[PDB]
Amino acid sequence: TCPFYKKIPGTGFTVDAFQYGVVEGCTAYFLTHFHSDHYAGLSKHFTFPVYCSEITGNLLKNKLHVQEQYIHPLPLDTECIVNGVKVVLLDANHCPGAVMILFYLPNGTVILHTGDFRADPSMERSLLADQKVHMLYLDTTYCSPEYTFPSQQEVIRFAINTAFEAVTLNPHALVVCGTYSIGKEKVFLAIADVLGSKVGMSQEKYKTLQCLNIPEINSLITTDMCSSLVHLLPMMQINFKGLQSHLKKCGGKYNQILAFRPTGWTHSNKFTRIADVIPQTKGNISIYGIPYSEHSSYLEMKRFVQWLKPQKIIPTVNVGTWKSRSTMEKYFREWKLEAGY
């Protein structure tokens, strides 16, 4: 049974609600982004209208085989009427094709559903500037002040400088980057660009990337692993055992691995600056965990909510414990008392 925080009142709509069977009253199912916790339950046998971005709809058609007649792609930043209700999709600054959804209810209520997002001051000049929001369905993944991490640009600067140094010292080093979903593509694309290489990967991963409308992608990626000095591997293989095994397969072309694991936040963020990050090393293998987030930090979240001034907040993450819920509610009230709304 579908939980309340996935339903949009006053409509026939649900958000990210595909794992509950046929939801009573639902005439259109919205999908914010192509991450498995959110698409859980979609497959080629789905027969109700799915509304989403163009990129999400490429992934549904080619990776999940959803039939074309049930996929309804909407342009961004454009007022659209769906089953008699005005909606807008906005870029969520999450993974490729991820959106926030603005719903203009027939009674005058305005609802923003963030999906998953990384709040940014650029959102203060989208179509959100123009009107009041009554209800905010909020991605609360990192809603506590201990959750700090650097900008994506500082993280990428670290990665490119680390990779370029290592490979200039040893031209026979291979770089490997872990992946298990879409998102975070700038990590491996920025490192390959500084090294003058295409990125090499499995046919399954190449297929996924080919759905993402990235400019000039054919110039940036390949399935010919032998021609590439930046490889992608599943995240589960980014360990000393799995990397040893990979280095054997490369036919003595390489004699060292430098590997990256983009994580979200880890507790080493509560002590160490990005500049001071060091790898774990065993012989000719080194592994860097880098804090590349596609979710809001606490400060970024707070800034966004204090600017938007919603009347009511409904969290969509960390909802399963009373301690989490109470924590989140306390910070919402602080934010409102501090800013005066």
Tell me the two tokens of residue 242.
Answer: 């799995």
CB 137, CB 15: distance < 8 Å: yes
Q: How far is CA 161 from CA 25, 50, 157, 282, 333, in A?
A: 54, 42, 6, 21, 42
Nearer to Ni ion, 52 or 229 (CB): 52
Nearer to Ni ion, 17 or 247 (CB): 17
Q: How far is the CB of 295 from Ni ion (least distance, A)?
A: 8
User: In the chain, where do the E strands start and end?
Assistant: 7-8, 13-15, 28-30, 50-52, 71-73, 80-82, 85-91, 99-104, 110-113, 135-138, 173-179, 199-200, 221-222, 230-234, 256-263, 280-282, 285-291, 312-315
Q: How far is the CB of 231 from Ni ion (least distance, A)?
A: 25
Q: What is the C-alpha separation between 206 and 219, in angstroms, rounded?
A: 13
Q: Is 16 in the site for Ni ion (CB under 5 A)?
A: no
Q: What is the C-alpha separation between 302 and 297, in angstroms, rounded?
A: 9
Q: How far is the CB of 339 from Ni ion (least distance, A)?
A: 28
Candidates 31-39, 228-236, 250-258, 298-306; binding stretch for Ni ion (CB under 5 A)? 31-39
C-alpha atoms less than 13 angstroms from C-alpha of 29 in its C-beta half-sphere? 25
Nearer to Ni ion, 34 or 304 (CB): 34
Nearer to Ni ion, 35 or 113 (CB): 35
Q: Is 35 in the site for Ni ion (CB under 5 A)?
A: yes
Q: What is the C-alpha separation between 17 and 41, in angstroms, rounded?
A: 8
Q: Which of 6, 59, 112, 116 touches Ni ion by CB under 5 A?
A: 116
Q: How far is the CB of 116 from Ni ion (least distance, A)?
A: 4
Nearer to Ni ion, 6 or 35 (CB): 35
Q: How far is the CB of 98 from Ni ion (least distance, A)?
A: 7
Q: How far is the CB of 139 from Ni ion (least distance, A)?
A: 8
CA 32 to chain centre: 11
Nearer to Ni ion, 198 or 294 (CB): 294
CB atoms under 10 Å from CB of 118, counted, come to 23
Candidates 63-71, 111-119, 200-208, 296-304; binding stretch for Ni ion (CB under 5 A)? 111-119
Q: How far is the CB of 36 from Ni ion (least distance, A)?
A: 9
Q: How far is the CB of 166 from Ni ion (least distance, A)?
A: 31
C-alpha atoms less than 13 angstroms from C-alpha of 300 in its C-beta half-sphere? 24
Candidates 99-107, 113-121, 162-170, 191-199; binding stretch for Ni ion (CB under 5 A)? 113-121
Where is 337: in which H helix or E strand? helix 322-339
Candidates 108-116, 162-170, 233-241, 254-262; binding stretch for Ni ion (CB under 5 A)? 108-116
Contacts of 39 (CB under 8 A, 6+ apart): 16, 18, 31, 60, 64
Using CB under 5 A as the binding criterion, the count of chain residues that bind Ni ion stands at: 2
Amino acid in the structure at residue 198: K
Q: How far is the CB of 94 from Ni ion (least distance, A)?
A: 6
Nearest to 171 by CA among 244, 245, 229, 222: 229
Per-residue DSSP letter, 311: S
Q: Is 185 in the site for Ni ion (CB under 5 A)?
A: no
Nearer to Ni ion, 116 or 300 (CB): 116
Nearer to Ni ion, 180 or 341 (CB): 180
Nearer to Ni ion, 115 or 150 (CB): 115
- Give me the residues that bind Ni ion (CB under 5 A), please: 35, 116
